[model samples]
Target chain A: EFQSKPLLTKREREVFELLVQDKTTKEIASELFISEKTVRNHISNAMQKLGVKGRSQAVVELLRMGELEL
Target chain B: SKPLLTKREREVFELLVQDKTTKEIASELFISEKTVRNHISNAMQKLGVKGRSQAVVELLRMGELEL
Candidate 1:
């Protein structure tokens, strides 16, 4: 497995923070006033960059990196 | 000031930044199981963040959020 890599874009970072806090797509969409599809796309992209199997893994690893707290 | 946080994210994050769990967050926010999962996932991706923790760190750095 690849070590965690930092690869979030400006917008993606915003979305990811909420994700950790357990936000919902519809909530996010409504909050940002963006489409759900767009939010999905951002999550998908984050997964690709993190080199993890899925969202949980990404969150777990991020916590490990000291790159995140909470 | 940093970028923007979606309204939902702010809500979710408010609890999360406080270090709340997904299950607790779901219940607190009254959202669906999958939707909560999806929300976190989408947020990570949109922020281009490697993970939730990183996203939080990045947000603090960006000044979009504190703590």
Candidate 2:
């Protein structure tokens, strides 16, 4: 099996943690004190990096990679 | 709006998919950071993804991801 990839940057990891909690873009933006667009951008960037197509897919990938708890 | 990625774009894209930073990718691929950024941009364009998050979503949905 492919080894788990390297960890995300600090900022990216924070965003990924929020995603694991099931926060929407708006919610994550509000909590992180960043614009929704920024949150979306981070998520988008992560998705591309992870090679997933959607948020759910990214979540699944994270789980598989042991990067997320839920 | 950005266009979809080309075949070459996919090569760079795989690195991003693995969560490699521009700097790491630059070193690993022996390319410039700017080039890595460009590849990401190109891939985003081709995917019509608004942000990296959306791109991941779409990629997963399309079964483009391996893990």
Candidate 3:
């Protein structure tokens, strides 16, 4: 009960973790060897699931959820 | 003066400080995620914050939400 469990899928978590580290979508895409479009899609999907409006908000939400560290 | 936070808002804030997602908070509390969002939104409005993180920080500063 100490750790808040994350609801993000593995891909979503990867994208979100990178986001928490202040990585740009392009940077994340390059690091993950995926297209930027794919990265954006993952972020978009994550935003919806987190009930947030944008990528920054998604990061805030994920951080609040204890799914990511600064 | 108006209350800083309502009971429901306080509940939501507590869960938020614990890093619980809206969905997880709703599931744990047996409420809808829409309701969870409403509570958070209301709290943010009351706290005069524009975002969830701001709201959370404000509540912590006010001692209304605990870590």
Candidate 4:
């Protein structure tokens, strides 16, 4: 079985789900009505919690953990 | 059940789990980088995932690919 833990905050999950949809950081920021810096910060925090080195890996980890579904 | 992955897709997934770049995988496989990306994209679609990394993780969890 895969890891099934919830590892993202509400904001982080929002950012990650958008990222999985192939949205750029700028697009995400625009959609979320936040600054690009804020978007990056959420992604950074998600990456740390997922123990991944980048946005893609973090998304992979989130999917594996059942935190985000396609 | 037939395997969710094709032989070539399995190869792509194997390299992907190793964190190999698309260009690197293309070079090693003697294929175009766009081909490499297309294979990953195809795998992602077949796996019902939305991204390459998600596809890799799903394959690993299903024992179709090793870490």
Q: How well is each residue in A1-70 modelled by candidate 1, as lDDT tens digits?
A: 6876556776677776777666788777778789999998987887787776556556655666554456
Which regions of candidate 2 deviate over 4 angstroms? A1-24, A27-70, B1-4
- Candidate 3 Cα deviation (angstroms), residue B55: 0.5
Better-scoring candidate (TM-score), 2 or 4: 4
TM-score of each: 0.45, 0.49, 0.49, 0.56
Highest-scoring model, lDDT? 4
lDDT string for model 1 (B1-67, tens) is 3456687776776666655677878999999767776877776676767656656655655666644
Give the number of colliding residue pairs in candidate 3: 1
Instruction: Score candidate 2 by TM-score against the native.
Output: 0.49
Q: Which candidate number has the best TM-score?
A: 4
Model 1 chain B: ten consecutive residues of lowest lDDT: B58-67
- lDDT measured at residue B27 in model 2 versus the true structure, 0 to 100: 89
Candidate 4 Cα deviation (angstroms), residue A70: 0.7
Over B1-67, each residue of candidate 4 has an lDDT whose tens digit, in order, gives 2238777778977876655777888988999999988888888888877667656656756779643
Residue-level lDDT tens digits of model 3 in B1-67: 2347877778887876665778888998899999999998887778766666666555655667655
| Candidate 4 CAPRI level | incorrect
Q: Cα lDDT of model 1 overall?
A: 0.69
**Candidate 4 wrongly placed segments (more than 4 Å):** A1-5, B1-12, B18-67
lDDT of 4 at A66: 79
- The clash numbers for all candidates, in the given order, read 15, 25, 1, 0
lDDT (Cα, tens digit) per residue for candidate 2, span B1-67: 3344565566665666665666877888888999877877766677765566555555655656545
Residue A7 lDDT in candidate 2: 61
Report residue B23 deviation for candidate 3 (angstroms). 0.8
**CA shift at B48, candidate 2, in angstroms?**
1.5
Give the lDDT ranking, best first.
4, 3, 1, 2
